[PDB]
Amino acid sequence: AERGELDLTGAKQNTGVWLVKVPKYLSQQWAKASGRGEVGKLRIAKTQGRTEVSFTLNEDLANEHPFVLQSVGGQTLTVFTESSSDKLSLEGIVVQRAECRPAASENYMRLKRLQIEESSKPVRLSQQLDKVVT
Amino acid sequence: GPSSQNVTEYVVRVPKNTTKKYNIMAFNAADKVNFATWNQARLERDLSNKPEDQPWLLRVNGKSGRKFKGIKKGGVTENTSYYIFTQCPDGAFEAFPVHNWYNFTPLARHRTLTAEEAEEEWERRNKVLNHFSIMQQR
Amino acid sequence: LSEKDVDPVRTTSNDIVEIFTVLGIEAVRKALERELYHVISFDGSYVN
Amino acid sequence: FIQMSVQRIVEDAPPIDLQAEAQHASGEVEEPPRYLLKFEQIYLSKPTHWERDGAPSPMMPNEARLRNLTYSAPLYVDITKTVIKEGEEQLQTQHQKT
Amino acid sequence: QEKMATNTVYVFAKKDSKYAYTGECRSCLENSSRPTSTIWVSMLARGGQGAKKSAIGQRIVATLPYIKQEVPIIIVFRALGFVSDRDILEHIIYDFEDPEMMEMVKPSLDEAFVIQEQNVALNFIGSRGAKPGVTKEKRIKYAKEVLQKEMLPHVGVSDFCETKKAYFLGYMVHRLLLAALGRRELDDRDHYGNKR
Amino acid sequence: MEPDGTYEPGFVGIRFCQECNNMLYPKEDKENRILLYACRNCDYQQEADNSCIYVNKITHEVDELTQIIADVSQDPTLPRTEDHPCQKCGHKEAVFFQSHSARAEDAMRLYYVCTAPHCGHRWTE
Amino acid sequence: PILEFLEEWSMENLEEISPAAIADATKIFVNGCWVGIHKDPEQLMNTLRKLRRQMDIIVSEVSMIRDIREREIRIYTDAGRICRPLLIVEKQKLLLKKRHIDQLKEREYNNYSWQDLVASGVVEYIDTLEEETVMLAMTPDDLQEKEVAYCSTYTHCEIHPSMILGVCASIIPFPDHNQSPRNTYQSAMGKQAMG
Amino acid sequence: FHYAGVSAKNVTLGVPRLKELINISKKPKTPSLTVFLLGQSARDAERAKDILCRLEHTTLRKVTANTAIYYDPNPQSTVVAEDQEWVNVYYEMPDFDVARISPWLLRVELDRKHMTDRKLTMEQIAEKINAGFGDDLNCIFNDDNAEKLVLRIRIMNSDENKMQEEEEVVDKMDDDVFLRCIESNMLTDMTL
Ligand SMILES: [Zn+2]
Ligand SMILES: [Zn+2]
């Protein structure tokens, strides 16, 4: 037992978790939902030889996100945590990777373009300066 | 069975704050990691640069097990985000933000290469004339 | 030149440094005149 | 060049700081004075000429050729000086237009 | 004013010199720090120490900025932190199933063996470049500063894109090696596609 | 035996080390007639399979239906042909071209790529 | 913004992968910089082309090229590339129609202009690197003739061939009945003709 | 350029030749000799072919179809089962020092058309290489009527003196690697 030792319990329990890439507006809505205890629901529907995963947004937070699964045979991921109680722990192994994609296509772009406006717009050169004397 | 028309739905929680910060620990598949052998491990900040600005040093099963170095994700998720999705006993999902992504790679054990005493000099003479014997004379 | 069945009389070169080493200064005088003669005839114009 | 590059260059990466060698041979108690300067918004008038009087006027590109002037315009920038001393005060910042 | 284009790799023949082939890459944020441009990745030719294995036309080296002498590219990779050949070759070969290329890279790995550690590899680059001094550790710091800032600045200037930079070197070796098998045609010196 | 037997004894560069992942080199055991491959920086050694460790100049890895990736067929500037019957699918529309390689070598022989999704199949003439 | 769009679309970052497990993918470059890899270049290339013609990506400042025999896609947004306007032909026909011509004649009192014409996405600016990949047709005539001709794959079309001429070679009449060095000699003398 | 016969990647023409000639250049851009032939060789194509062959500076690298290096200590159990007949063929070829030959094997494959054009024989090559490197380089070869042309090479030593007297004045050079140096030099040097 020591401060430099890592807790392996999670690893030894074979705990599996999912890793998902998501677009900024969704993370921004979750940052606006703060911690109310819901942001929406995740739905998984499997067939005879096909499995389909998706997320659907909360009506309130809005006031279908399909998931694409990615091979994990190329890299091995687990997760560790750095507690405020200074006690490091290995929580589990990453058993799945995925990417959250938008369902809207072109309209979206405008939001993005609006998003572009939000990221890109401090005043550059932009306005001469008429004529000063002092 | 129902398994061929099974529909499942879970709630998603995103707590505003957590006592512990959340990290990724990533390994190459090529590295053939085996967590069953990880009887013990240590996790300490690296010492080459001699805290929150330095790479990580991972020591498993101490000096006998494997030793790895951890480097911080150089890229930044400015247009994306990474989240962990976890199942909870109540029947819902919890999602946690990735505070950092660290890339872990094997250091070597007693491979041993001084490369300082006269190896630079021996290189001037090097005609691939020898290889085993110089490593041994240490 | 030293090889069998190669005519040791007419065998010649467009090179001049080598003609000097093997055949000696008079042969260079002839060969060098010939090589200059040869570039001039090609270009079609005649020089006296 | 005017709309992006010039503004980009002065905004970019030359913030500067300066600090005298106080507490020399002795000192103590508090402050080795330090000063920080940073450049921001940039301004560019219409082309102007200044008569010997000092009176500024609208220049015309033909007038520039017959008298041999130089058809150019004056450039001005927002500069800030930013007094965060080693303790007693962190704010005493001043806006200029230069 | 017409110039030859920036931050793009070209593989061209230079049969008149000791280099069999060269990869030139002029690197610059013509809208960034506006410093300089350099890196050459070169395939050697015409030579033989005697009974080394001989064959000089696989002995790939790299000219770096500020460095006074040519250094083998594998040494630069080992200075970036990678130590295992498979990983350098993974950075290099992608397809993994080209045994021909693997033997082509093989003498460079054979030359690497003396500096298999990062620190000494850095010190090697230091001695090849800096002024002679007993400041080994400082010399390593200087060497580190060159590879981070002065090599391929258009790839990055910070720790945070030091790994990414290693992928780009592998692309410069790959592109060079591709021209040397003849699987890819050479880049013409005077194609406007390569000018600004 | 026969001269028809292909020439691919296994060129083989990598099967590198299993421990430190560096390159293996041949080395002798005069005692058991066995080749071994050893990492130069560690004590690991293992026997080789084939006695072959190097070959040079197949002089004809004609490379006629390899490396030429099938996505080449989407290229609009390559000549589509009415010349029919891909040798796999019952559809024409082969895209064709010379050499495409600097060992051009001197080839004038055409290479044909079927362009419909049912093949991707390639073949020389 | 180009880097942003690709990152949200599908392009995997270089550190997200192990090369020996995904090296087969098409490579992506932005101003000579290797940003990542992609497993479907034809759709993405088609989409980027669709955006640039839709004005979501700055047309005059962005070139986009696919080199299919090396399975990589480089895009350039740098200054100093020479590019020219060309017509976009699709389905083996012009995308520009007579309705636009009557709209252009209308400008004597209409505010409709060349910029509107580019936004119709019937013309694109094509730089020399990209000009290496197009199948450019000399005239609409040839593009019609194609039913008997060898090529039926055109992508762009010349707005007119005499435009390959610079200012001084343009003052001179019937230049093609001139033996070619005569055209160079006039262009010089043209600067010396006083007026 | 003036197209003529087969040649004409020949003799620099004009002012560049005037500069080349008048400077007394040590390194002309295109040096040549016009060689004339005598006897039957002045009127027969095949005779001319024979003299040309003697003149043509061919090196073994130009001639070789292929090379391979094999690990085979004892021939009488060859790793290449098809080679097994030469072992039947070559058991009496210095039968004592099969106990001395190195277990590293070099194999060369030759093209029959290219070997024909030089009108060269396998015995002349074996004798040329043997004479150049010395008795140390132990060479044997195949039947000229085989459909595959092969040269089989091992390396021998001086027997008596090599018993690890001090540490073997070679500094333990790898023998495969030395065999590559033989292959490097054997091809690049041998002026058959
Ligand atoms: Zn090893
Ligand atoms: Zn087909």
Side-chain angles (χ1 to χ4, degrees), chain C:
Chain C
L1 279 168
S2 301
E3 186 56 32
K4 200 177 60 67
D5 299 334
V6 162
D7 182 17
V9 170
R10 301 168 70 196
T11 286
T12 190
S13 171
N14 70 335
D15 187 19
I16 295 301
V17 185
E18 283 287 337
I19 285 286
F20 178 50
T21 302
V22 179
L23 302 180
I25 195 59
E26 284 296 303
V28 176
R29 200 293 196 154
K30 279 294 303 185
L32 188 64
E33 101 197 331
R34 282 177 171 197
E35 280 288 298
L36 285 174
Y37 183 84
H38 190 302
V39 298
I40 300 302
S41 299
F42 219 97
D43 173 86
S45 197
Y46 159 72
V47 167
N48 193 359

Side-chain angles (χ1 to χ4, degrees), chain F residues 34-120:
Chain F
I34 64 177
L35 186 53
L36 305 172
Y37 276 138
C39 181
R40 286 188 170 179
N41 65 46
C42 66
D43 55 358
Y44 181 67
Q45 63 170 22
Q46 56 161 255
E47 71 205 87
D49 48 338
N50 208 331
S51 292
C52 170
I53 59 97
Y54 175 60
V55 303
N56 198 334
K57 295 296 189 188
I58 309 283
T59 82
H60 226 181
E61 36 216 81
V62 288
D63 194 17
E64 57 177 355
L65 299 177
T66 32
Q67 282 64 34
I68 176 60
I69 56 97
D71 298 327
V72 67
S73 62
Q74 293 152 26
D75 185 347
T77 73
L78 287 166
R80 301 304 194 286
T81 205
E82 74 276 19
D83 175 89
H84 39 118
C86 167
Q87 68 178 24
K88 173 185 189 182
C89 85
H91 184 29
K92 56 166 180 68
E93 296 284 337
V95 190
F96 69 87
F97 42 79
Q98 276 174 6
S99 61
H100 275 125
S101 53
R103 234 193 67 251
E105 286 268 355
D106 185 45
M108 196 81 63
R109 184 175 56 187
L110 293 178
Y111 294 38
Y112 291 111
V113 187
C114 168
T115 187
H118 183 200
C119 290

